[PDB]
Structures are given as structure tokens and as C-alpha cells.
């Protein structure tokens, strides 16, 4: 019958990991043509698309997506740059998680300390009452930098050498395990990574959170970090959310994505 | 010669305090007609304006200002709603203050604790090492609510009864004085309010900060709260910023505003 064009605008490293022959071939076998977006030409002069997927940042790419969205309201963008932006301030991101509605399993948000300058990082009294280890992230980051990754701190001296502005979370109530939950539209997958280089949370609970994050963030492609609060044992916290992660690591990612692409071009 | 129309879109209480006969008459004496915007009609069908000043919130008023700004790019809006929004998240607001560049007087940003839910407000260990009193604000607020005001907390029991999500700042290093600095474009005024119901900071320093906030926030009308860190005695912190404050309280506000309106319609 008819064919659907899936335009992709990805950095070369993300093309190499995500746009694999096995994905291109599975999708073509179902009538879907994955077509790269030329970065050296405007998207406006670039050919019919039934779906645009991207992981590019900055005001020129944003402007192109803003114009594309005006010219072609019915063509889904995954994901809209105003929705990716909701992840860029750690404090406003966790604010979005705090808006979700709430069985046997409970859902929390971990308190944060924000330190804006070097003087505060030396002299703020409260920092001497922190339990270690800490999770530290820059307050604002898009993920593109290596220094935008959540990093562990083991003592006051290590904290003292970080670059403010930063957000600090205590990291002691979780029994040294982290659950990375991969989401693709209505579909969840879950990876029992072990932090500080086990029993998974209930699947129905994870699906409720995954779906609430999708509706609240307006993102189809993301992965959320979750911990068990092992004081109580049936309490869980979301500690991070990341746009369009390394799906290529999960075996069977090609089938999950192809199913998602097919769903999106029949919305 | 020609006359200039200054449209104003204000709540009735703000009309009563700010749009006083003495302001209307001074401005008319200089060729400037202050004209109220009809809230029951679209702004698009509302008459030539050489300047629009407002203090209204919400998506309908925003949409009207977005359309006005497209149709009439050369007519200044004071202030643009995307710029007022920069004040609505306390953490991203202080992030904007942290971006300013930096003599005898130094300039800091106070560390904050963010508490997202009721469980954290009871159980977060770090809160038992806070010094009191604290400044507490909701993480997100526009100022229109009575509960959106920065409030003082004197002990753990009082902290325990607040409504998260909230931002906590220790409030002990300032020797019980707060400086409210009123800004109108390039012009500063300064009020030695005494907190917890004196020597002012140097005027050149205040003007540098006022001007950096104006460029960074893109606001003409605001007031910033500043404290002296009395450990060192030549260090100052910005602890709050508010859109379009009670200028009518300062004597001589009519002359300051009329001069600002005249400057804006000759940009
Ligand atoms: Cl990938
Ligand atoms: Cl007023």
C-alpha cells in the first residue's frame, strides 16, 4: 500500500549506535523508510516526512522545528524541543515529577541542595551535615557535555572541587541498586544497573510512572532512574530522566522502535 | 507636537495604587495619554498604543501579547511575559542572578534546599542541621497569591506545617536588615526595610547590580531584595526579585515613571 518516511536528525555518534542496518531493514520491510535529514540544508526544503525523530540542540535547529511544526501540524515531531527543555533544569524537571498523581508501592522525590557559587561551596554550614555519598549534577545542562552526567561524591574534599552552580542529593537510602527504565511511547523496558561500581519494582507500578512521565513531560523517548528506599522497602524515588537514550544497547530494540514508528505514522 | 498613548492592563487594585490622578496629569502635561486596556475586548481591536504596560497573568493575556508583539514589533511591551516568567521558579531566577559578571563590595547568591513532598518535609535528615530563622517560598509561584510571598520560619515545628514543594534559605548572616531596591529602567531607588518585625550598600554597586539584572532578566520594572553578609561586612546577597512592585509607596514615583514612559516612547 502507501510508504511512510521517517526523517531522522541525529549526531553521527547517535546515527552509528541507533540507525543500524537491522533497524533500517525491519522498518523498510513494513513500509517505513528511515531517511536522514541533511544538516547542511534547511529542513523546510527537505522532502515529505510522516514522522521526524531527532536529538539535536541549539536555537537554529529549534527555529527549523518551530517552522516545521507551524507548516505541518499533523506530522509528529519526536520529540518537540519545548518538551525536551523540561529536562534541562534538574529542579524544574523534578517539579514535573512532583505533579504526577499516586496502591502497595509509594512514589517519592528526593530533596536537593542548590549551591550557586564557589564561596557557598566552601562556607555553607549545612553542607557539613550531609551524609555521603552524594549525587551531584549541574543545575542546567542539555546532556551533550560529559560534565552534564550525574556524578558521585564520596567526601567533603571531592564536593569542594566541583563546579557550581550544582544540585546535591544524598545517596544512602537505596541499598546500592538503581533501576534504569527505558520508555518508548506506551512501552516500558527495565535494567537493574548496580550503582557505586536484585529485586526489581513491580511492573504495574513502573508502567503507571512511565505513563505519567510521558503525559507530564510530553516525551515519547526517555529513560528514568529509580531507587528503592530500603528503610520501608515498598517506597521508590525517581532520581533522573534522560531524552532519547542508548536504546541500541537493549536486545530487541529494533522491533520495539519499528512498532513505535508504525503507531506514530497511524496517530 | 504629537501625543503618545500609554496603554495599561492592570488589575483593579494595581490601577487604584499605581494609576493615580497625579501620575495621569503629569504624563498628560508632557504629551502622554495613559489609556486603560479593556479586559472584556481583545487587545488586537484596541486602538493605537506607543507603549503597553501590564501586570496580568495567564495564557489568554499571554496569547494577546504574543500576537501584539508579532503585529507591532516596534511598540515596547513592559514587560514581555517570557521575561516575567524568569521570576516564577525561585531556583531558575537565582540561576539568572548567578550569570551576572562581577571592586570593594562582593556579590553572592544564597544556597537553597528544595523539598518536593510531605514525606521529605518530615524525614529529610539534613533539615535537622538548619539554622533558624529560614526564608521559605513555594518553588513555583507568579506573586498573585498571598501564599506566594517569602515567609519566615522560626523552628522545626513551623517548617513542618508548610506546603511543599518549597525552597528554604537560612536567614542568620544579615544582622536583621534587608534592602529593597526599586528599579525603573536605568533608574534605581532603595528602602532600608528592617526584616524580622542602618548602613545602606554603596550606590555605585547597587546600580551595577540593578543594571545587570535588567539586562539578564529583560525587565524594566522590578524590585530586588538584598542583604549584607555581616561576617565580612563588604559582601551582599540578592535573595529575591519581584515584577512591577508598589512604586506608588515611594514619594516622587510619578516623576520617575513619567520620565521612564517618555524615554520608552523615544527608543
Ligand atoms: Cl542508541
Ligand atoms: Cl503601585
UniProtKB/Swiss-Prot annotation, chains A, B:
The keyword Nucleotide-binding applies. Mg(2+) 1 binds at residues 225, 240. Expressed in the embryo of 15 day after pollination. Expressed in kernels at earlier stages but at very low levels. Expression in the embryo peaks at 15 days after pollination and then declines. No expression is detected from endosperm and vegetative tissues. Keywords: ATP-binding, Kinase, Magnesium, Metal-binding, Nucleotide-binding, Transferase. It comes from the Eukaryota. Disruption phenotype: Plants display reduced phytic acid content in seeds. Changing residue 171 to A: Strongly reduced InsP6 kinase activity. Changing residue 223 to A: Strongly reduced InsP6 kinase activity. GO terms for molecular function: ATP binding; inositol hexakisphosphate 5-kinase activity; inositol-1,3,4,5-tetrakisphosphate 3-phosphatase activity; inositol-1,3,4,5-tetrakisphosphate 6-kinase activity; inositol-1,3,4-trisphosphate 5-kinase activity; inositol-1,3,4-trisphosphate 6-kinase activity; inositol-3,4,5,6-tetrakisphosphate 1-kinase activity; magnesium ion binding. ATP binds at residues 90, 137, 148, 169, 172, 195, 239-240, 242. Gene3D superfamilies: ATP-grasp fold, B domain. It catalyses: 1D-myo-inositol 3,4,5,6-tetrakisphosphate + ATP = 1D-myo-inositol 1,3,4,5,6-pentakisphosphate + ADP + H(+); 1D-myo-inositol 1,3,4-trisphosphate + ATP = 1D-myo-inositol 1,3,4,5-tetrakisphosphate + ADP + H(+); 1D-myo-inositol 1,3,4-trisphosphate + ATP = 1D-myo-inositol 1,3,4,6-tetrakisphosphate + ADP + H(+); 1D-myo-inositol 1,2,3,4,5-pentakisphosphate + ATP = 3-diphospho-1D-myo-inositol 1,2,4,5-tetrakisphosphate + ADP. One of its GO terms (biological process) is inositol trisphosphate metabolic process. Residues 101-267 form the ATP-grasp domain. The keyword Lyase does not apply. Its EC number is 2.7.1.134, 2.7.1.159, 2.7.4.21. Monomer. PANTHER family: INOSITOL-TETRAKISPHOSPHATE 1-KINASE, INOSITOL-TETRAKISPHOSPHATE 1-KINASE 1. Kinase that can phosphorylate various inositol polyphosphate such as Ins(3,4,5,6)P4 or Ins(1,3,4)P3 and participates in phytic acid biosynthesis in developing seeds. Phosphorylates Ins(3,4,5,6)P4 at position 1 to form Ins(1,3,4,5,6)P5. This reaction is thought to have regulatory importance, since Ins(3,4,5,6)P4 is an inhibitor of plasma membrane Ca(2+)-activated Cl(-) channels, while Ins(1,3,4,5,6)P5 is not. Also phosphorylates Ins(1,3,4)P3 on O-5 and O-6 to form Ins(1,3,4,6)P4, an essential molecule in the hexakisphosphate (InsP6) pathway. This is Inositol-tetrakisphosphate 1-kinase 1. It comes from Zea mays.
Amino acid at each position: 500500500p502507501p510508504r511512510y518516511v521517517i526523517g531522522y536528525a541525529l549526531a553521527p555518534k547517535k546515527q552509528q549506535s541507533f540507525i543500524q542496518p537491522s533497524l533500517v531493514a525491519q522498518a523498510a520491510s513494513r513500509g517505513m523508510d528511515l531517511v536522514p535529514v541533511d544538516a547542511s540544508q534547511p529542513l523546510a526544503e527537505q522532502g515529505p516526512f510522516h514522522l521526524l525523530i531527532h536529538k539535536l540542540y541549539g536555537d537554529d535547529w529549534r527555529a527549523q522545528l518551530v517552522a516545521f511544526a507551524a507548516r505541518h501540524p499533523a506530522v509528529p515531531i519526536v520529540d518537540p524541543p519545548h518538551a525536551i527543555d523540561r529536562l534541562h533544569n534538574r529542579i524544574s524537571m523534578l517539579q514535573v515529577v512532583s505533579e504526577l498523581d499516586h496502591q502497595d508501592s509509594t512514589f517519592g522525590i528526593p530533596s536537593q541542595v542548590v549551591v550557586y557559587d564557589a564561596a557557598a561551596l566552601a562556607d555553607f554550614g549545612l553542607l557539613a551535615a550531609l551524609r555521603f555519598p552524594l549525587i551531584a549534577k549541574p543545575l542546567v545542562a542539555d546532556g551533550t557535555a560529559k560534565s552534564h552526567k550525574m556524578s558521585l561524591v564520596y567526601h567533603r574534599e571531592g564536593l569542594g572541587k566541583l563546579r557550581p552552580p550544582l544540585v546535591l542529593q544524598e545517596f544512602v537510602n537505596h541499598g546500592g541498586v538503581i533501576f534504569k527504565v527505558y520508555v518508548v511511547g506506551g512501552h516500558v523496558t527495565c535494567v537493574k544497573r548496580r550503582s557505586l561500581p536484585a529485586v526489581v519494582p513491580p511492573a504495574a507500578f513502573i508502567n503507571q510512572i512511565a505513563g505519567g512521565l510521558r503525559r507530564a513531560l510530553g516525551l515519547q523517548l526517555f529513560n528514568f532512574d529509580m531507587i528503592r528506599d530500603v528503610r520501608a522497602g515498598d517506597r521508590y524515588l525517581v532520581i533522573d530522566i534522560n531524552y532519547f537514550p542508548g536504546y541500541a544497547k537493549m536486545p530487541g530494540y529494533e522491533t520495539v522502535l519499528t512498532d513505535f514508528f508504525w503507531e506514530m505514522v497511524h496517530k
